[PDB]
């Protein structure tokens, strides 16, 4: 009854994960795989695909052209401050979360979307690039790699952990329970009902070793591998957050979201 009553309840992190996100990973490997995208990996295709793709954020939107380093960073918030979006919706429809006050939801979001951002990332992540405009454009690693620091130091401790999540081989299915695992954690500083979120938490935890149980038959020490990734999240986003500390020291000329800006205040 443990086991039957979880089930159930992944069903809804699920429908939650399916209603909420732009692109699911079943999306974004059939993409990625063949089963196509505009390749940008220069100036000349980076201009050509504002050119020619469709962004969700319109270029003129952005803050004022500065260079090419920029621009990328420019896009790189577009797409984090919309999975924000995302992610909050995402977690309004799971019931324990919104039950919760709303500044412990507010407390959570917070701390924890970086987390799922980049869990999230590697879905439409492979070891050359990554894509973009909703699957129309692919921009290459190399191409990344080449921006100026510190922009492209922010980049590619993201592909590095993204290449060695993907080994795992998970679903949305899983991936719904994993992101909403990260967001309903109770170790954030200043949760106010702490009992709760940790009893929340313990539930999709145990939600997720069952449907892992059932969903991945053979593989071996998959939960646990995931508990770690959990851990290694939070050291990616320690580190993130100290090169955004830079960024904001060093580049004054570049414009930060406000509400990024809020998410690094403390
Ligand atoms: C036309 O030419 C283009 C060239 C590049 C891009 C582009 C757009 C989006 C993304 C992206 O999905 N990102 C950003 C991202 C991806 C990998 C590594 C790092 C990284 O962002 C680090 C900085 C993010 C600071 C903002 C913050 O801290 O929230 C996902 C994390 C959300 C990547 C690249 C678009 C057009
Ligand atoms: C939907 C967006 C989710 C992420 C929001 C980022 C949270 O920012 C925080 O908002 C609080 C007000 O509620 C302030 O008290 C904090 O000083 C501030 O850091
Ligand atoms: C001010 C510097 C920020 C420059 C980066 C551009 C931000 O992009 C967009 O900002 C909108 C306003 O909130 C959000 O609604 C969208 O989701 C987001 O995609």
């Given at each position: 009854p443990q086991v039957a009553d979880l089930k159930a309840f992944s069903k809804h992190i699920y429908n939650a994960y399916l209603k909420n996100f732009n692109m699911t990973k079943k999306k974004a490997r059939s993409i990625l795989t063949g089963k196509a995208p505009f390749v940008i990996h220069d100036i000349e295709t980076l201009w050509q695909a504002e050119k020619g793709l469709v962004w969700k954020?319109?270029?003129?939107?952005?803050?004022p052209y500065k260079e090419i380093s920029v621009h990328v960073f420019y896009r790189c918030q577009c797409t984090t401050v919309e999975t924000v979006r995302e992610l909050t919706e995402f977690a309004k429809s799971i019931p324990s979360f919104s039950s919760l006050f709303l500044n412990d939801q507010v407390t959570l979001l917070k701390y924890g979307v970086h987390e799922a951002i980049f869990a999230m990332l590697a879905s439409i992540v492979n070891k050359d690039g990554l894509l973009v405009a909703n699957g129309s454009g692919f921009v290459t690693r190399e191409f990344l790699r080449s921006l100026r620091k510190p922009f492209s130091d922010i980049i590619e401790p993201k592909f590095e952990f993204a290449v060695k999540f993907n080994?795992?081989?998970?679903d949305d299915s899983d991936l719904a329970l994993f992101i909403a695992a990260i967001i309903l954690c109770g170790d954030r500083p200043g949760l106010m009902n702490v009992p709760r979120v940790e009893a929340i938490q313990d539930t999709i935890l145990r939600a997720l070793e069952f449907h892992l149980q059932a969903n991945?038959?053979?593989?071996?020490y998959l939960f646990p591998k995931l508990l770690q990734k959990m851990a290694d999240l939070r050291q990616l986003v320690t580190e993130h957050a100290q090169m955004m500390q830079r960024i904001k020291k060093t580049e004054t000329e570049t414009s930060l979201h406000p509400l990024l800006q809020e998410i690094y205040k403390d």
């Open positions: 954020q319109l270029v003129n939107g952005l803050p080994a795992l081989e998970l991945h038959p053979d593989a071996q």
